[PDB]
Nucleic acid binder design. Structure first.
Ligand SMILES: [Mg+2]
Ligand SMILES: [Mg+2]
Ligand SMILES: [Mg+2]
Ligand SMILES: [Mg+2]
Ligand SMILES: [Mg+2]
Ligand SMILES: [Mg+2]
Ligand SMILES: [Mg+2]
Ligand SMILES: [Mg+2]
Ligand SMILES: [Mg+2]
Ligand SMILES: [Mg+2]
Ligand SMILES: [Mg+2]
Ligand SMILES: [Mg+2]
Ligand SMILES: [Mg+2]
Ligand SMILES: [Mg+2]
Ligand SMILES: [Mg+2]
Ligand SMILES: [Mg+2]
Ligand SMILES: [Mg+2]
Ligand SMILES: [Mg+2]
Ligand SMILES: [Mg+2]
Ligand SMILES: [Mg+2]
Ligand SMILES: [Mg+2]
Ligand SMILES: [Mg+2]
Ligand SMILES: [Mg+2]
Ligand SMILES: [Mg+2]
Ligand SMILES: [Mg+2]
Ligand SMILES: [Mg+2]
Ligand SMILES: [Mg+2]
Ligand SMILES: [Mg+2]
Ligand SMILES: [Mg+2]
Ligand SMILES: [Mg+2]
Ligand SMILES: [Mg+2]
Ligand SMILES: [Mg+2]
Ligand SMILES: [Mg+2]
Ligand SMILES: [Mg+2]
Ligand SMILES: [Mg+2]
Ligand SMILES: [Mg+2]
Ligand SMILES: [Mg+2]
Ligand SMILES: [Mg+2]
Ligand SMILES: [Mg+2]
Ligand SMILES: [Mg+2]
Ligand SMILES: [Mg+2]
Ligand SMILES: [Mg+2]
Ligand SMILES: [Mg+2]
Ligand SMILES: [Mg+2]
Ligand SMILES: [Mg+2]
Ligand SMILES: [Mg+2]
Ligand SMILES: [Mg+2]
Ligand SMILES: [Mg+2]
Ligand SMILES: [Mg+2]
Ligand SMILES: [Mg+2]
Ligand SMILES: [Mg+2]
Lengths: 197, 49, 172, 106, 127
RNA sequence: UUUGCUCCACACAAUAUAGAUGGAUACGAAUAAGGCGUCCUUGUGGCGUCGCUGAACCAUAGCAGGCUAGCAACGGUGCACUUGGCGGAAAGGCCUUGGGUGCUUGCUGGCGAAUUGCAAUGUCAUUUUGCGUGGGGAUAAAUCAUUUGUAUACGACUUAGA
RNA sequence: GCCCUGAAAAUGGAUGGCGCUCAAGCGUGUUACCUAUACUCUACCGUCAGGGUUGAUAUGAUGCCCUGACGAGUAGGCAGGCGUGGAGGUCAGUGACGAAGCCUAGACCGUAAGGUCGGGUCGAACGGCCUCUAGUGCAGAUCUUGGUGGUAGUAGCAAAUA
RNA sequence: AGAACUGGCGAUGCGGGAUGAACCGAACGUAGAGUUAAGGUGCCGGAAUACACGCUCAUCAGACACCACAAAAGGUGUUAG
RNA sequence: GAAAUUGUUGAAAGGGAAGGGCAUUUGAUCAGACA
């Protein structure tokens, strides 16, 4: 529908976000995902911490360097949920994956580009009220991720600039509405009402 | 089958690999925490043994 | 077993010279179709009478429709069923708009709570509870209070495209 | 104008297949804006071109086309099956595809 | 100018090569049937080479026709060639491999006179 | 080592392409709650309004978009300039001034289109490289061999030499 | 009923994996949808069966023509065919104006055994058809004889003072 | 380890049970179109992140026949009786 | 003057083997048939 879709991970549930992201790439839609630190997983923090430690013990006994690799960053926990939903040892699969990008925070390009959401993976739409859940960033710091603070700091900075932007814009569309209303009631506008506009 | 007698392993797995270093000048992997209330100063120094 | 119709079924043991005009017995039966219905009939007659289908005959089979299908009714429901380790009688109450609707949710309920498949259940009686206050089970009494109202918090709308440009709102 | 398009955008998804055998003879097509089999019934019969480029000029052009037709709908979400003059190359799973408005019945 | 014929359909143009004739030089491609007790090929497990069988046989109607729709007839000399005088819509002469160049130009001339097609006219051609 | 390198420009030739074909259209936060307008005692404030999907918004007419005239506006927008400022998370992009110039389908005119023959993607994008031309610009090093021994099985390392 | 305790083993690790919590879990119900060498219709191959057809003056009576059904296969049986050395017959067959042989991700016929051609190389002989005959068809047998590889520029070429 | 009756594997590919001689479906000439079986339809992966009523929250939840195990006993967790 | 095996030349592919099946893209190559 658009050349590149930018997804605001915040408030999405990992494997449901993954399931849709994977399909899209396979079908040829480039996807970039931001604020993976604000991803969720159902299940209380402790549960998913225990799960993560299960993962953590699997290693190649003769050489741990060849063994399963354990990435600690929310973006990359995420990639993992994703990568495992893609026939990723096939050309067709590598190709789909090159179509993907994932970030903690919203770094340049994407901070001035619109981001969407994916309602069929929106936690607030899916999880029954009262069911505990985990935030990706908090899970990740506990298994080694080093950059929650730095991301938080940048994000607060970015969030201030974006508040300005918004404000300016909302000021501007107020003017624009003031304009659109002198033109209301005019002849060309009554005609357009007639045609559903 | 199970050792027989127990004894500590030989040597420390946290100093692997036992390869030659990438340089004669060992790297400083960490500097003292910063306390910006004190005057500005170096935090290390070169010399020859 | 499905979406139920209710049937009157009438049978009798076959006539004989010395006994022409045998007695004629009736059952109401909840089934998805008349084939299952005549089957169920023979199933219960044999738990009650010296008969079986080879020596009996179906006299009539007719669907009974609800008298007042758009009138809300409080049903009393009486069931026999088997569990994994014994067999048990039960009384339940179901609020709906037809016996037929009511019996569907019963099997559903029996399957969900007690894990009883259809084979394991005998409906003993389904009867409309005429006076509120002969209503016994509180999960229904609840819906009889005067001027009753309730909101439906946390509204969740079905998206029709995979992407959305807003950020939904569960207001309602 | 800026738009000169007379076709609907589409996508080569897959060959027809079971869990572990595919069938290069029938392709599965996703059509933009088509979400149901009832919608997709409109496009049955419409003709379909996968358009691509090549390094070596031929009868004038450096652009070649494989032609096909939509043939039936496929499943419940608007996906469609199509056949082509020659089966589609399979590097094209995920490639864009053009669905035309002819043969027209409006 | 061959007799009209229904479209020629070949059913299996790919050559049936012996199993493992791609794996060891000692095994020629010439079709040979597996008789082993365990062989995947003989047992026809999904994924191996198929085997020649009578289903593949061609339409009695177009069998033996070449693309031109003529059956080929091998020919050593003008007399052989002339056995096709009344069948130029049906058979085509192939000049045999061991015919000399000077005898080919005679055979070819007479074919032209009789309207008989020749499948390999350029052979040994004094060009 | 036979005139080489680099940035900008155009030119011919190639080579390609995981797949342009109107627009990736920027708060944040909450969801048992919020957006927007408005007033005010500026607050966990009053009052109004909206949702129930982007089925939107923006754009969109002209030989794939030709050649031309005028009117009403003084608006819009393309381009190359120029003024002030911002953005380091991967800023490599955003904003602002001012003159110039093109287009304007805001409205009203003149001319052109056929024969591509009843369809044939009917060719309009963006990759990397190669060769000459001429506007700027810039004028090294590494390796062998030799040498040190803080190094070394051999390579490697580490020194030294106009 | 579901869940929880009761519930201890050795390389790291398996509801197939990812992951999933008003499920993508458990029980039950209702539609739709995906797809087997199976089922339905059709073409073509072959097998078996049942019919028709000696009437010359043209060419297969083991023929031609219509029709129906059927097709898995080790051990094994039978059948119709492909190929090789020699033999009787025949084609008054091929050939120094190039036989045989050999090479050839060139062509063509056959379901296949195989057959035919072109081009290159070559130098003296050879083939079709009816029939006769057998020392007549190889991937194997720790097969026989000969040739040849990877191993590999590798082990090594260091006892006896120089 | 040994019998009975049938059906299979051995001698048999094909679709399903991830995998697998024997289970489920279905038995094979070369092909087109259609429809199904058993089994499936979040993504891997063709196919509803379909509909509907309940139940379940596990600091070692559970997840489909053959089949890849769990018992006595116990819970003021929760459910219905 | 075959094959195994080898040198050079030319073309191509190559993220823990290679080779194979069905299908098509791309390159190279080629028969036939038109009149
Ligand atoms: Mg441990
Ligand atoms: Mg011990
Ligand atoms: Mg190094
Ligand atoms: Mg299988
Ligand atoms: Mg053999
Ligand atoms: Mg066997
Ligand atoms: Mg590519
Ligand atoms: Mg409000
Ligand atoms: Mg406000
Ligand atoms: Mg307020
Ligand atoms: Mg909008
Ligand atoms: Mg214009
Ligand atoms: Mg005009
Ligand atoms: Mg970036
Ligand atoms: Mg220059
Ligand atoms: Mg499990
Ligand atoms: Mg699953
Ligand atoms: Mg269920
Ligand atoms: Mg549906
Ligand atoms: Mg078939
Ligand atoms: Mg048939
Ligand atoms: Mg057979
Ligand atoms: Mg013979
Ligand atoms: Mg012979
Ligand atoms: Mg002999
Ligand atoms: Mg010769
Ligand atoms: Mg060869
Ligand atoms: Mg030929
Ligand atoms: Mg020659
Ligand atoms: Mg001689
Ligand atoms: Mg003979
Ligand atoms: Mg012998
Ligand atoms: Mg053999
Ligand atoms: Mg041999
Ligand atoms: Mg051998
Ligand atoms: Mg053998
Ligand atoms: Mg040998
Ligand atoms: Mg030897
Ligand atoms: Mg040497
Ligand atoms: Mg040596
Ligand atoms: Mg020695
Ligand atoms: Mg045996
Ligand atoms: Mg079988
Ligand atoms: Mg997978
Ligand atoms: Mg799918
Ligand atoms: Mg059981
Ligand atoms: Mg299993
Ligand atoms: Mg209990
Ligand atoms: Mg010689
Ligand atoms: Mg191949
Ligand atoms: Mg091929």
């Amino acid at each position: 529908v658009e050349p590149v879709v930018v997804i605001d991970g915040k408030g999405h549930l990992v494997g449901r976000l993954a399931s849709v992201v994977a399909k899209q790439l396979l079908n040829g839609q480039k996807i970039v995902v931001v604020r993976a630190e604000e991803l969720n997983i159902s299940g209380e923090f402790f549960r998913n911490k225990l799960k993560y430690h299960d993962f953590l013990r699997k290693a190649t006994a003769f050489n741990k360097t060849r063994g399963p690799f354990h990435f600690r960053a929310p973006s990359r926990i995420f990639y993992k949920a994703l990568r495992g939903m893609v026939s990723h040892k096939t050309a067709r699969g590598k190709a789909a994956l090159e179509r993907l990008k994932v970030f903690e925070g919203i770094p340049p390009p994407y901070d001035k580009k619109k981001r969407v959401v994916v309602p069929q993976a929106l936690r607030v739409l899916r999880l029954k009220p009262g069911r505990k859940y985990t935030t990706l960033g908090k899970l990740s710091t506990s298994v080694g991720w080093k950059y929650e603070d730095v991301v938080a700091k940048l994000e607060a900075k970015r969030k201030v600039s974006s508040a300005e932007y918004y404000a300016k814009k909302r000021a501007f569309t107020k003017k624009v509405a003031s304009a659109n209303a002198t033109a209301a009631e005019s002849d060309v506008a009554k005609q357009l009402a007639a045609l559903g506009y | 089958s199970h050792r027989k007698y127990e004894a500590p392993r030989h040597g420390h797995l946290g100093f692997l690999p036992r390869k030659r270093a990438a340089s004669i000048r060992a790297r400083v992997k960490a500097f003292p925490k910063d306390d910006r209330s004190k005057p500005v100063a170096l935090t290390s120094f070169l010399g020859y043994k | 077993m499905a979406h139920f119709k209710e049937y009157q079924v009438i049978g009798r043991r076959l006539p004989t010279e010395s006994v022409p005009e045998p007695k004629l017995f009736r059952m109401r039966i909840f089934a998805s179709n008349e084939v299952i219905a005549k089957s169920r009939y023979w199933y219960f007659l044999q738990k009650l009478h010296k008969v079986k289908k080879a020596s009996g005959e179906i006299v009539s089979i007719n669907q009974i429709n609800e008298a007042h299908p758009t009138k809300v009714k409080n049903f009393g429901v009486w069931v026999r069923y088997d569990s994994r380790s014994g067999t048990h009688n039960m009384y339940k109450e179901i609020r709906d708009v037809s016996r037929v609707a009511a019996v569907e949710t019963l099997y559903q309920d029996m399957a969900a709570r007690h894990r009883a498949r259809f084979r394991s259940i005998h409906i003993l009686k389904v009867a409309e509870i005429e006076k509120t206050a002969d209503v016994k089970r509180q999960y229904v009494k609840q819906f009889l209070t005067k001027d009753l109202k309730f909101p439906l918090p946390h509204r969740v709308q079905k998206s029709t495209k995979t992407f959305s440009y807003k950020r939904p709102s569960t207001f309602y | 104008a800026e738009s000169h398009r007379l076709y609907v955008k589409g996508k080569h998804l897959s060959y027809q297949r079971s869990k572990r055998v595919n069938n290069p003879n029938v392709s599965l097509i996703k059509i933009e804006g088509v979400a149901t089999p009832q919608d997709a019934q409109f496009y049955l019969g419409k003709r379909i071109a996968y358009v691509y480029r090549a390094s070596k000029e031929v009868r004038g052009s450096k652009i070649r086309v494989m032609w096909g037709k939509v043939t039936r709908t496929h499943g419940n979400s608007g996906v469609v099956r199509a056949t082509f003059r020659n089966n589609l190359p399979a590097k094209t799973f995920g490639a864009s595809v053009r669905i035309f408005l002819y043969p027209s019945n409006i | 100018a061959s007799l009209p014929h229904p479209k020629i359909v070949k059913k299996h143009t790919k050559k049936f090569k012996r199993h493992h004739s791609d794996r060891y030089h000692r095994v020629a491609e010439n079709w040979r049937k597996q008789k082993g007790i365990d062989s995947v090929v003989r047992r026809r497990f999904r994924g191996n080479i198929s085997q020649p069988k009578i289903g593949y046989g061609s339409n009695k109607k177009t069998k033996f026709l070449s693309p031109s729709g003529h059956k080929t007839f091998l020919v050593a000399n003008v007399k052989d060639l002339e056995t096709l005088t009344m069948h130029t819509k049906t058979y085509a002469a192939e000049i045999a491999h061991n015919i000399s160049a000077k005898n080919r130009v005679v055979i070819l001339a007479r074919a032209k006179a009789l309207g008989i097609k020749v499948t390999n006219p350029k052979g040994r051609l004094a060009l």
